[PDB]
Design a binder for this molecule. Structure first.
Ligand SMILES: *[P@@](=O)(CCCCCCCCCCOC(=O)NCCCCCC#C)OCC
Ligand SMILES: [Cl-]
Length: 161
């Protein structure tokens, strides 16, 4: 699937779904997840509680409450196991699989930087990029970045080559 890189707040993404990097317990905290709790509202954690624990590397879908998307796809990158390039690969693939199963088109990711600080950044980018590339072209992916400088850096890299 194609990806477009933009600056923004993923909780303002208007489209079919946002991907939420998660622990496998599916319990939300601060950061992007905190914005989801607040802006999405109580139904998101309530539905996560109804799903219960999943395995690291899997994904699970909830509604999105008052967010401007239909679904939140929670992608379990760590929790009862530490993050690894393998868990990143599996969680990205699993999140995309859920989007395909739901018949979605537009899906947003963050860089997952705040979940992968112990892993080589270039490798994380490669593995996520590879899984997104392999996903069907029925999906259109948006990468949402905190700063314009960084969003543009991702765009420039997408040219070369
Ligand atoms: P910023 O703070 C960091 C700039 C990093 C530039 C990256 C260049 C190579 C990336 C190759 C592909 O990356 C991806 O495919 N990553 C996965 C998909 C996107 C995730 C969603 C996001 C958001 O700027 C400072 C100069
Ligand atoms: Cl994040």
């Amino acid at each position: 699937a194609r990806i477009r890189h933009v600056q923004g707040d993923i909780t303002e993404f208007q489209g079919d779904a946002i991907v939420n990097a998660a622990n496998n317990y599916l319990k939300l905290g601060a950061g992007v997840a905190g914005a989801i709790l607040r802006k999405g509202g109580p139904s998101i954690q309530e539905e996560c509680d109804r799903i219960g624990k999943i395995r690291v590397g899997e994904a699970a879908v909830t509604g999105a409450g008052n967010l401007p998307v239909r679904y939140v796809i929670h992608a379990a990158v760590l929790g009862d196991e530490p993050a690894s390039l393998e868990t990143v690969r599996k969680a990205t693939k699993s999140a995309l699989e859920k989007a395909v199963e739901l018949g979605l088109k537009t899906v947003a990711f963050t860089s997952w930087g705040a979940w992968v600080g112990g892993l080589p950044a270039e490798a994380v980018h490669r593995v996520m990029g590879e899984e997104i590339k392999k996903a069907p072209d029925t999906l259109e992916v948006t990468g949402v970045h905190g700063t314009e400088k960084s969003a543009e850096a991702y765009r420039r890299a997408s040219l070369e080559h």
